[PDB]
Amino acid sequence: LVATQTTNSQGVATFTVLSFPGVTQTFKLVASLQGYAASTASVSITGQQNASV
Amino acid sequence: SLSVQGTTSESASVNVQYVPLTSTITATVVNQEGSPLAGATVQLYNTTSGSNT
């Protein structure tokens, strides 16, 4: 766990997260809002890329 | 072969090819885990006959 944010009124949660030097960083996003079934996506930033799911 | 049997005899062997039309029809399986599924025996049937040829 390096971050835990909430979706605002643009529906954006912005994570400022580190870049490893050349190592690909698989990050699992577990997203939930109670009253809707929990959903998951795992996207990988291969270096600095803005991974929007 | 144009055997041009006119006023002028021209005999030209003009080689030509042919192949019927052919079509690719596609099945797909997926899971919402974010991984496509596999391991399928997938049978396409010529059900243009009126029957599953």
From TrEMBL, chain A:
Organism whose genome encodes this protein: Sulfolobus acidocaldarius (strain ATCC 33909 / DSM 639 / JCM 8929 / NBRC 15157 / NCIMB 11770)
Q: Which residues of the full protein are shown?
A: 160 to 212 of 475
What name does UniProt use for this protein? Conserved membrane protein
